[PDB]
């Protein structure tokens, strides 16, 4: 974005409402699930 032909200012939300619901919650949940898997893995690895 350092050289192009567009409105220079940074202001947008093109199709965000059905995607904000998607990512912002989905990734966090996903990051939560990845944390959970990390926990299960670490404790299991200590066990084995």
């Amino acid at each position: 974005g350092s050289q192009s032909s567009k409105v220079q200012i940074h202001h947008n939300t093109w199709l965000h409402f059905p995607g904000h619901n998607l990512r912002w919650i989905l990734t966090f949940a996903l990051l939560f699930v990845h944390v959970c898997e990390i926990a299960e893995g670490i404790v299991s690895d200590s066990q084995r």
Binding site: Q3, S4, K6, V7
Partner: protein, 335 residues
């Protein structure tokens, strides 16, 4: 107390702002154009990042690839050679680790090739990924090489350095007024076919209703053949007289203290060694021009050779001047 918006900021760099431009778009190829012109700091990192990425990616395509054809197991179970002879089906000879695989990866996309990891011809998928890795390596290598050459080609041109004096003056030469800035030069090479143009920006209504909002007239400069060329070695003083035809002809002693004027000056030309066109812009708003003081001499004949002095680039001294307007001074002899 804000300054009324200026058409060209004092340090060049025209500060306009047009919007509602139909977003043309963001061409897929645009990243490459942006990629070509980077600070050397980045093009010595994106190099490393691209190479290291490609290496690691093909390595992972590779440690796993050694496992699938039975390579990891033969070496591990018994001795590599003491207990048994080779399985002979090893995809790449002696490729022991997802560490060893990474090391092997360095040979294919970097063209070094040690020899202790040969490529057997059994596993066809291995041959497929070898072709693919080699092609990608060549394409990445060529693109990066072209980028490095572009940023070594443009090490000659650096920056426009053409210096106008801070503010203008207004004095009298041969019983008539004038208008002076002081252009100049810095580096060794002269400019070629350098040209100068003076434009005055003003809000012009028309006797037929129309009111051009920000309208730009061109005015002639001074030269004994009425030609806009110029040839500079030491700073010159490019006057542009005011007369009945000129638009500044209605300026006044008091009115210039609160006035709507904008005298932009543009200078064009090439540079001999680089052979590249260039131009430079700057200005003079109403606040910036102070009447009656001409500029000060520069060239001094030293004992040996001429000397051009910069200590007083923009220095000014007052001199005799009448306070009337241009049309006032030529209004009548007795006037």
């Amino acid at each position: 107390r804000l300054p009324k918006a200026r058409f060209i900021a004092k340090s060049g760099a025209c500060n306009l702002a047009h919007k509602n431009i139909r977003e043309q778009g963001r061409f897929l190829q645009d990243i490459f154009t942006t990629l070509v012109d980077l600070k050397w700091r980045h093009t010595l990192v994106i190099f490393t990042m691209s190479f290291l990425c490609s290496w690691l990616l093909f390595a992972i395509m590779w440690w796993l690839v050694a496992f699938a054809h039975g390579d990891i197991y033969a070496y591990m179970e018994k001795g590599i050679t003491e207990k048994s002879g080779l399985e002979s089906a090893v995809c790449v000879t002696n490729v022991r680790s997802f560490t060893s695989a990474f090391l092997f990866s360095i040979e294919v996309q970097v063209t070094i090739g040690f020899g202790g990891r040969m490529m057997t011809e059994e596993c066809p998928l291995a041959i497929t990924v070898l072709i693919l890795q080699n092609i990608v390596g060549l394409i990445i290598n060529a693109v990066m090489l072209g980028c490095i050459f572009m940023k070594t080609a443009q090490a000659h041109r650096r920056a426009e350095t053409l210096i106008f004096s801070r503010h203008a003056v207004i004095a009298v030469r041969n019983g008539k007024l004038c208008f002076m800035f002081r252009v100049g030069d810095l580096r060794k090479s002269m400019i070629i076919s350098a040209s100068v143009r003076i434009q005055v920006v003003k809000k012009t209504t028309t006797p037929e209703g129309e009111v051009v909002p920000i309208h730009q007239q061109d005015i002639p400069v001074d030269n004994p053949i009425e030609s806009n060329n110029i040839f500079l070695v030491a700073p010159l003083i490019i006057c542009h007289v005011i007369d009945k035809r000129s638009p500044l002809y209605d300026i006044s002693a008091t009115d210039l203290v609160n006035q709507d004027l904008e005298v932009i000056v543009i200078l064009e030309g090439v540079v001999e060694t680089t052979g590249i066109t260039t131009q430079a812009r700057t200005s003079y708003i109403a606040e910036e021009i102070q009447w009656g003081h001409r500029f000060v001499s520069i060239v001094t004949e030293e004992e040996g050779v001429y000397s051009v002095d910069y200590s007083k680039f923009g220095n000014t001294v007052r001199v005799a001047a009448p306070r009337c307007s241009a049309r006032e001074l030529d209004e009548k002899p007795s006037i």
